[PDB]
Amino acid sequence: ALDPLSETKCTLKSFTVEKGIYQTSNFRVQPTESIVRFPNITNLCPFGE
Amino acid sequence: KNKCVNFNFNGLTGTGVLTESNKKFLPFQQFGRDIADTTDAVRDPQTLEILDITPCSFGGVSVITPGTNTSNQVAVLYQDVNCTEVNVFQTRAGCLIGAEHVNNSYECDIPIGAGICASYQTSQSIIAYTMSLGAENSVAYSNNSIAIPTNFTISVTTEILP
Amino acid sequence: VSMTKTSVDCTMYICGDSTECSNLLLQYGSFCTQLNRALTGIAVEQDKNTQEVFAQVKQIYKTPPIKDFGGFNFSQILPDPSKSKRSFIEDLLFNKVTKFNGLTVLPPLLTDEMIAQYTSALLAGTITSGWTFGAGAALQIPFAMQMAYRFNGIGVTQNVLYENQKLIANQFNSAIGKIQDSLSSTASALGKLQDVVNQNAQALNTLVKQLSSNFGAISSVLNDILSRLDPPEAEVQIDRLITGRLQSLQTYVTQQLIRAAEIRASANLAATKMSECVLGQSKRVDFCGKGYHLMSFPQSAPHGVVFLHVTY
Amino acid sequence: GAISSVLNDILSRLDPPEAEVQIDRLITGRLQSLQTYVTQQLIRAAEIRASANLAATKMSECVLGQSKRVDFCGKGYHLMSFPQSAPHGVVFLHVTYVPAQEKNFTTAPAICHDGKAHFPREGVFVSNGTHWFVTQRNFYEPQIITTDNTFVSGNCDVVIGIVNNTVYDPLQPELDS
Amino acid sequence: VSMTKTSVDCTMYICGDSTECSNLLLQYGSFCTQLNRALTGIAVEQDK
């Protein structure tokens, strides 16, 4: 977990790595803000009366 | 909008990216799914508009590297994303960071995909270019001139089959 | 020839956006590690099945400006550079061919332009050079002289072509239009490639529909079980959901290897047919279709190939 | 999914009414590991068996005979393959015929001696700029055009693009001498 | 050349004459549909 060059060596469990392209990991984006999608005040309770 | 957010509906949970849409829902419907049961567009309950649920920047982490006895330079290839949600070059498989775009088409040494390959040539750096399918040659068509070989070369090819 | 490069990841399929799911996923061994390497090995074979079939010539031969190839109408098989470089035959083959929960759809190594350049190179080598471009250097022999040896390989004297130079042009040019009238009217001739799409559109869509299944648990959504049940109590229902999705992923890669085994057997046949029937002359009866083998014209096709054989 | 990986660890710590749940998770878990192993090996062995139908074809046709199939046993005109031993496989040595150089010579579809169209029996007609010769498509050889290497069919009014040449008849100088 | 066409249905083999079995069989979704279409594809190839 230092560089993407080392991710190919630890995947194949060998230091001798030839040319090519190998899958190492997956890119994930953490959600920074959770927005609750709810409608507006659709009808207040009659507390005034 | 345009960010990986976590929407919280009254009867639907999940994460995604909200953006503009070109569809138009029915005035009584609120949900919208894909063919194989995948919710990708919902109606905003506050403002009567259509917003798509785009999945976030997910993709496999792939790298392009030569042999260990030659050099150590690499090129990061983030799949299924562009070069804006993350030596900048955009491919069909994803954004390639680390390689230099060269207009000269050379031989495909390390394949990437979609007609794009990379190679480590000499100063020495990994370049990105469209692959060449062969040498430039044109057969001269003539109805009164043919080419017949006078010299031959007996070559021995090696074929390996399991 | 090829198939759709689908790489389904078991990380976001069973444990999409969950932390406790990953702790209960690694305890089942390396089953997600083996299924990721199995689907990766298909994508290596999908990049090799395109190269070993199409890329048979080390050079690319361009279209000569002389179009008088013995009076034959070869404008239908050659691609139009003023159009992607596609022809009228390739346009009918592209428009007559009939998801983000861990399913990665990777593009192939060669797009539709790269196969069209291999089509423009192999058809230029077959007409303007004969069959010598595959065995060695492309001998600049015209199309009217290479057909004299093609008749001698099946036991026909070469005096038939020289005395009927106008009779072949009235029959061969009319047979090309019968192929275009059969593909534009219906898609029954292209059923060999539509079955590959039917084994992929019904395979990729059925895998996402298994997430809505209960699989013996109290719910289908993984977030619904964690947000309602206790963390010492939800582990019974979660482990029944991961094991239920593990058998769905085990059956998926099994169906993506047995059905692809016939494609890999056809890719070893498409590499054999294009090297023998197109790049040479064979004496095998009914190998390039019904009739005597004279030549063959390959065309581009989505995840396949179309051979326009010429029979006697 | 069990509490341990050793079969003797669960039976020595848990009760026999309670250890049977954890043992059955290990038996069903190791059965799917063998179910994945037999499935992955048999599909890969089917590719070996598909290669076994191909490797037996090369050692029966191209090794034990001269195949006329172009680009089936190597690039070029194959003559004879020499197989060698290999661990779980075979290594072939295909002897092919590959040309080296080429020369552009003037050709002709047919010639006219006295009105009839003479067609070549084997090969095509060539020319070095002065005289008209006949050779094959694979190797150039300045052979003299005779009646034995040609075929008489039709006339010279049908073939478009024909030339005129005198056929060297060996019967002519033998009778005059 | 060919093989005996045998279609094993997962309705009478899994839940043959049982009402409560079909309530738990539908919880797996289309798993029997994957097994029926796999054996149906053999019957198309046996005719080909």
PDB file of N, CA and C in Angstrom, chain A residues 4-5 7-9 15-40, chain B residues 4-10 18 42 44-46 51 57-68 72 74 77 109-111:
ATOM      1  N   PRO A   4       1.052   2.224  -6.906  1.00  0.00           N
ATOM      2  CA  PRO A   4       0.385   1.253  -7.792  1.00  0.00           C
ATOM      3  C   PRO A   4       1.328   0.283  -8.494  1.00  0.00           C
ATOM      4  N   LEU A   5       2.636   0.555  -8.523  1.00  0.00           N
ATOM      5  CA  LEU A   5       3.589  -0.432  -9.024  1.00  0.00           C
ATOM      6  C   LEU A   5       3.668  -1.637  -8.094  1.00  0.00           C
ATOM      7  N   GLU A   7       1.251  -2.712  -6.192  1.00  0.00           N
ATOM      8  CA  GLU A   7      -0.021  -3.420  -6.140  1.00  0.00           C
ATOM      9  C   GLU A   7      -0.075  -4.584  -7.119  1.00  0.00           C
ATOM     10  N   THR A   8       0.740  -4.552  -8.175  1.00  0.00           N
ATOM     11  CA  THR A   8       0.802  -5.670  -9.109  1.00  0.00           C
ATOM     12  C   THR A   8       1.657  -6.805  -8.554  1.00  0.00           C
ATOM     13  N   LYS A   9       2.684  -6.470  -7.769  1.00  0.00           N
ATOM     14  CA  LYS A   9       3.566  -7.496  -7.218  1.00  0.00           C
ATOM     15  C   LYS A   9       2.885  -8.275  -6.100  1.00  0.00           C
ATOM     16  N   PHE A  15       7.772 -11.030  -7.358  1.00  0.00           N
ATOM     17  CA  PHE A  15       8.442  -9.782  -7.704  1.00  0.00           C
ATOM     18  C   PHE A  15       8.664  -9.648  -9.204  1.00  0.00           C
ATOM     19  N   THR A  16       8.813 -10.764  -9.913  1.00  0.00           N
ATOM     20  CA  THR A  16       9.006 -10.742 -11.359  1.00  0.00           C
ATOM     21  C   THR A  16       7.667 -10.452 -12.028  1.00  0.00           C
ATOM     22  N   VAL A  17       7.492  -9.220 -12.498  1.00  0.00           N
ATOM     23  CA  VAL A  17       6.260  -8.782 -13.144  1.00  0.00           C
ATOM     24  C   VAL A  17       6.598  -8.375 -14.571  1.00  0.00           C
ATOM     25  N   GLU A  18       5.937  -9.007 -15.537  1.00  0.00           N
ATOM     26  CA  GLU A  18       6.145  -8.698 -16.941  1.00  0.00           C
ATOM     27  C   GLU A  18       5.243  -7.539 -17.363  1.00  0.00           C
ATOM     28  N   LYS A  19       5.256  -7.230 -18.656  1.00  0.00           N
ATOM     29  CA  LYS A  19       4.434  -6.155 -19.183  1.00  0.00           C
ATOM     30  C   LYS A  19       2.973  -6.592 -19.280  1.00  0.00           C
ATOM     31  N   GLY A  20       2.085  -5.608 -19.250  1.00  0.00           N
ATOM     32  CA  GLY A  20       0.662  -5.837 -19.325  1.00  0.00           C
ATOM     33  C   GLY A  20      -0.068  -4.957 -18.335  1.00  0.00           C
ATOM     34  N   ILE A  21      -1.365  -5.216 -18.188  1.00  0.00           N
ATOM     35  CA  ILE A  21      -2.228  -4.462 -17.287  1.00  0.00           C
ATOM     36  C   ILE A  21      -3.058  -5.449 -16.476  1.00  0.00           C
ATOM     37  N   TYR A  22      -2.977  -5.343 -15.153  1.00  0.00           N
ATOM     38  CA  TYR A  22      -3.692  -6.223 -14.243  1.00  0.00           C
ATOM     39  C   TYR A  22      -4.535  -5.400 -13.278  1.00  0.00           C
ATOM     40  N   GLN A  23      -5.695  -5.943 -12.918  1.00  0.00           N
ATOM     41  CA  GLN A  23      -6.585  -5.283 -11.973  1.00  0.00           C
ATOM     42  C   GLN A  23      -6.032  -5.417 -10.561  1.00  0.00           C
ATOM     43  N   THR A  24      -5.968  -4.296  -9.841  1.00  0.00           N
ATOM     44  CA  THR A  24      -5.391  -4.259  -8.504  1.00  0.00           C
ATOM     45  C   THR A  24      -6.443  -4.024  -7.428  1.00  0.00           C
ATOM     46  N   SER A  25      -7.227  -2.955  -7.542  1.00  0.00           N
ATOM     47  CA  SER A  25      -8.228  -2.625  -6.537  1.00  0.00           C
ATOM     48  C   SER A  25      -9.388  -1.914  -7.225  1.00  0.00           C
ATOM     49  N   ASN A  26     -10.256  -1.299  -6.423  1.00  0.00           N
ATOM     50  CA  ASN A  26     -11.421  -0.582  -6.918  1.00  0.00           C
ATOM     51  C   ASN A  26     -11.460   0.810  -6.310  1.00  0.00           C
ATOM     52  N   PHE A  27     -11.788   1.800  -7.136  1.00  0.00           N
ATOM     53  CA  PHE A  27     -11.869   3.186  -6.696  1.00  0.00           C
ATOM     54  C   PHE A  27     -13.259   3.467  -6.140  1.00  0.00           C
ATOM     55  N   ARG A  28     -13.310   4.022  -4.931  1.00  0.00           N
ATOM     56  CA  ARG A  28     -14.563   4.286  -4.238  1.00  0.00           C
ATOM     57  C   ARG A  28     -14.565   5.713  -3.710  1.00  0.00           C
ATOM     58  N   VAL A  29     -15.693   6.398  -3.879  1.00  0.00           N
ATOM     59  CA  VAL A  29     -15.869   7.771  -3.419  1.00  0.00           C
ATOM     60  C   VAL A  29     -16.820   7.757  -2.232  1.00  0.00           C
ATOM     61  N   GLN A  30     -16.346   8.254  -1.091  1.00  0.00           N
ATOM     62  CA  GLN A  30     -17.171   8.346   0.105  1.00  0.00           C
ATOM     63  C   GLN A  30     -18.162   9.502  -0.030  1.00  0.00           C
ATOM     64  N   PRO A  31     -19.432   9.288   0.323  1.00  0.00           N
ATOM     65  CA  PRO A  31     -20.406  10.390   0.288  1.00  0.00           C
ATOM     66  C   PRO A  31     -20.109  11.420   1.371  1.00  0.00           C
ATOM     67  N   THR A  32     -20.000  12.681   0.956  1.00  0.00           N
ATOM     68  CA  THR A  32     -19.626  13.756   1.866  1.00  0.00           C
ATOM     69  C   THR A  32     -20.821  14.397   2.559  1.00  0.00           C
ATOM     70  N   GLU A  33     -22.009  14.324   1.961  1.00  0.00           N
ATOM     71  CA  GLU A  33     -23.188  14.953   2.540  1.00  0.00           C
ATOM     72  C   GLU A  33     -24.420  14.136   2.183  1.00  0.00           C
ATOM     73  N   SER A  34     -25.231  13.825   3.193  1.00  0.00           N
ATOM     74  CA  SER A  34     -26.473  13.082   3.011  1.00  0.00           C
ATOM     75  C   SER A  34     -27.631  14.075   3.014  1.00  0.00           C
ATOM     76  N   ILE A  35     -28.293  14.213   1.870  1.00  0.00           N
ATOM     77  CA  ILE A  35     -29.406  15.142   1.707  1.00  0.00           C
ATOM     78  C   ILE A  35     -30.702  14.345   1.760  1.00  0.00           C
ATOM     79  N   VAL A  36     -31.565  14.681   2.714  1.00  0.00           N
ATOM     80  CA  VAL A  36     -32.854  14.018   2.869  1.00  0.00           C
ATOM     81  C   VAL A  36     -33.854  14.694   1.939  1.00  0.00           C
ATOM     82  N   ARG A  37     -34.408  13.925   1.004  1.00  0.00           N
ATOM     83  CA  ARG A  37     -35.317  14.450  -0.015  1.00  0.00           C
ATOM     84  C   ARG A  37     -36.750  14.205   0.446  1.00  0.00           C
ATOM     85  N   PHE A  38     -37.342  15.225   1.065  1.00  0.00           N
ATOM     86  CA  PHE A  38     -38.707  15.195   1.561  1.00  0.00           C
ATOM     87  C   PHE A  38     -39.504  16.362   0.985  1.00  0.00           C
ATOM     88  N   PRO A  39     -40.819  16.210   0.813  1.00  0.00           N
ATOM     89  CA  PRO A  39     -41.625  17.323   0.297  1.00  0.00           C
ATOM     90  C   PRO A  39     -41.798  18.440   1.317  1.00  0.00           C
ATOM     91  N   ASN A  40     -42.411  19.536   0.887  1.00  0.00           N
ATOM     92  CA  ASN A  40     -42.607  20.689   1.764  1.00  0.00           C
ATOM     93  C   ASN A  40     -43.806  20.535   2.696  1.00  0.00           C
TER      94      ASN A  40
ATOM     95  N   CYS B   4     -21.444  12.989  -5.285  1.00  0.00           N
ATOM     96  CA  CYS B   4     -21.819  11.687  -4.739  1.00  0.00           C
ATOM     97  C   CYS B   4     -22.470  11.900  -3.380  1.00  0.00           C
ATOM     98  N   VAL B   5     -23.801  11.943  -3.360  1.00  0.00           N
ATOM     99  CA  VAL B   5     -24.561  12.233  -2.155  1.00  0.00           C
ATOM    100  C   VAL B   5     -25.333  10.982  -1.745  1.00  0.00           C
ATOM    101  N   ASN B   6     -25.973  11.067  -0.582  1.00  0.00           N
ATOM    102  CA  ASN B   6     -26.775   9.982  -0.020  1.00  0.00           C
ATOM    103  C   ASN B   6     -28.205  10.494   0.125  1.00  0.00           C
ATOM    104  N   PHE B   7     -29.036  10.216  -0.876  1.00  0.00           N
ATOM    105  CA  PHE B   7     -30.430  10.628  -0.833  1.00  0.00           C
ATOM    106  C   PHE B   7     -31.219   9.737   0.120  1.00  0.00           C
ATOM    107  N   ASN B   8     -32.153  10.354   0.840  1.00  0.00           N
ATOM    108  CA  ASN B   8     -32.964   9.664   1.842  1.00  0.00           C
ATOM    109  C   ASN B   8     -34.434   9.937   1.543  1.00  0.00           C
ATOM    110  N   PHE B   9     -35.065   9.028   0.807  1.00  0.00           N
ATOM    111  CA  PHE B   9     -36.488   9.120   0.521  1.00  0.00           C
ATOM    112  C   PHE B   9     -37.285   8.447   1.636  1.00  0.00           C
ATOM    113  N   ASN B  10     -38.604   8.649   1.600  1.00  0.00           N
ATOM    114  CA  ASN B  10     -39.474   8.055   2.612  1.00  0.00           C
ATOM    115  C   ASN B  10     -39.598   6.548   2.421  1.00  0.00           C
ATOM    116  N   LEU B  18     -26.891  13.242  -8.234  1.00  0.00           N
ATOM    117  CA  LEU B  18     -28.062  13.893  -8.800  1.00  0.00           C
ATOM    118  C   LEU B  18     -27.629  14.916  -9.843  1.00  0.00           C
ATOM    119  N   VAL B  42     -35.632   9.664 -10.127  1.00  0.00           N
ATOM    120  CA  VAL B  42     -36.766   9.931  -9.255  1.00  0.00           C
ATOM    121  C   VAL B  42     -37.179  11.388  -9.418  1.00  0.00           C
ATOM    122  N   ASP B  44     -38.326  15.002  -7.898  1.00  0.00           N
ATOM    123  CA  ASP B  44     -38.116  15.806  -6.701  1.00  0.00           C
ATOM    124  C   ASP B  44     -39.462  16.180  -6.090  1.00  0.00           C
ATOM    125  N   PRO B  45     -39.677  15.921  -4.797  1.00  0.00           N
ATOM    126  CA  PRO B  45     -40.995  16.205  -4.209  1.00  0.00           C
ATOM    127  C   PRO B  45     -41.251  17.684  -3.975  1.00  0.00           C
ATOM    128  N   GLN B  46     -40.204  18.494  -3.813  1.00  0.00           N
ATOM    129  CA  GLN B  46     -40.396  19.923  -3.587  1.00  0.00           C
ATOM    130  C   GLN B  46     -40.691  20.655  -4.892  1.00  0.00           C
ATOM    131  N   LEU B  51     -34.916  14.470 -11.950  1.00  0.00           N
ATOM    132  CA  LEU B  51     -33.508  14.352 -11.591  1.00  0.00           C
ATOM    133  C   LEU B  51     -33.094  12.891 -11.674  1.00  0.00           C
ATOM    134  N   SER B  57     -18.456   7.678  -8.740  1.00  0.00           N
ATOM    135  CA  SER B  57     -17.210   7.390  -9.452  1.00  0.00           C
ATOM    136  C   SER B  57     -16.625   6.079  -8.934  1.00  0.00           C
ATOM    137  N   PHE B  58     -17.126   4.978  -9.487  1.00  0.00           N
ATOM    138  CA  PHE B  58     -16.656   3.641  -9.159  1.00  0.00           C
ATOM    139  C   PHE B  58     -15.974   3.025 -10.372  1.00  0.00           C
ATOM    140  N   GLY B  59     -14.841   2.380 -10.136  1.00  0.00           N
ATOM    141  CA  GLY B  59     -14.106   1.747 -11.212  1.00  0.00           C
ATOM    142  C   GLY B  59     -12.902   1.013 -10.665  1.00  0.00           C
ATOM    143  N   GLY B  60     -12.453   0.031 -11.441  1.00  0.00           N
ATOM    144  CA  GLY B  60     -11.304  -0.754 -11.038  1.00  0.00           C
ATOM    145  C   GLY B  60     -10.006   0.017 -11.184  1.00  0.00           C
ATOM    146  N   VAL B  61      -9.108  -0.195 -10.229  1.00  0.00           N
ATOM    147  CA  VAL B  61      -7.805   0.458 -10.209  1.00  0.00           C
ATOM    148  C   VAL B  61      -6.843  -0.410 -11.009  1.00  0.00           C
ATOM    149  N   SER B  62      -6.550   0.010 -12.235  1.00  0.00           N
ATOM    150  CA  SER B  62      -5.630  -0.694 -13.113  1.00  0.00           C
ATOM    151  C   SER B  62      -4.406   0.174 -13.371  1.00  0.00           C
ATOM    152  N   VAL B  63      -3.267  -0.479 -13.590  1.00  0.00           N
ATOM    153  CA  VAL B  63      -2.007   0.213 -13.820  1.00  0.00           C
ATOM    154  C   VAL B  63      -1.332  -0.399 -15.041  1.00  0.00           C
ATOM    155  N   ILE B  64      -0.474   0.391 -15.682  1.00  0.00           N
ATOM    156  CA  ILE B  64       0.310  -0.042 -16.833  1.00  0.00           C
ATOM    157  C   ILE B  64       1.778   0.065 -16.450  1.00  0.00           C
ATOM    158  N   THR B  65       2.490  -1.056 -16.502  1.00  0.00           N
ATOM    159  CA  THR B  65       3.873  -1.098 -16.062  1.00  0.00           C
ATOM    160  C   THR B  65       4.688  -2.005 -16.972  1.00  0.00           C
ATOM    161  N   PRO B  66       5.942  -1.634 -17.257  1.00  0.00           N
ATOM    162  CA  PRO B  66       6.842  -2.548 -17.971  1.00  0.00           C
ATOM    163  C   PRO B  66       7.467  -3.573 -17.038  1.00  0.00           C
ATOM    164  N   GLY B  67       8.427  -4.344 -17.546  1.00  0.00           N
ATOM    165  CA  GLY B  67       9.118  -5.308 -16.718  1.00  0.00           C
ATOM    166  C   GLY B  67       9.975  -4.652 -15.650  1.00  0.00           C
ATOM    167  N   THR B  68      10.233  -5.419 -14.587  1.00  0.00           N
ATOM    168  CA  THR B  68      10.970  -4.896 -13.443  1.00  0.00           C
ATOM    169  C   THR B  68      12.455  -4.719 -13.732  1.00  0.00           C
ATOM    170  N   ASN B  72      10.891   1.607 -13.654  1.00  0.00           N
ATOM    171  CA  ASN B  72       9.893   1.584 -12.595  1.00  0.00           C
ATOM    172  C   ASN B  72       8.749   2.567 -12.798  1.00  0.00           C
ATOM    173  N   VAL B  74       5.207   4.044 -14.022  1.00  0.00           N
ATOM    174  CA  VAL B  74       3.893   3.451 -14.209  1.00  0.00           C
ATOM    175  C   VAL B  74       2.940   4.511 -14.753  1.00  0.00           C
ATOM    176  N   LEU B  77      -4.527   4.135 -14.286  1.00  0.00           N
ATOM    177  CA  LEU B  77      -5.701   4.062 -15.154  1.00  0.00           C
ATOM    178  C   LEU B  77      -6.934   3.855 -14.281  1.00  0.00           C
ATOM    179  N   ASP B 109       2.572  -2.278 -27.944  1.00  0.00           N
ATOM    180  CA  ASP B 109       3.378  -3.117 -27.066  1.00  0.00           C
ATOM    181  C   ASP B 109       2.573  -3.625 -25.874  1.00  0.00           C
ATOM    182  N   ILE B 110       1.909  -2.725 -25.158  1.00  0.00           N
ATOM    183  CA  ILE B 110       1.060  -3.068 -24.026  1.00  0.00           C
ATOM    184  C   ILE B 110      -0.359  -2.623 -24.360  1.00  0.00           C
ATOM    185  N   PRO B 111      -1.307  -3.541 -24.533  1.00  0.00           N
ATOM    186  CA  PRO B 111      -2.667  -3.140 -24.898  1.00  0.00           C
ATOM    187  C   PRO B 111      -3.441  -2.576 -23.717  1.00  0.00           C
TER     188      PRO B 111
END
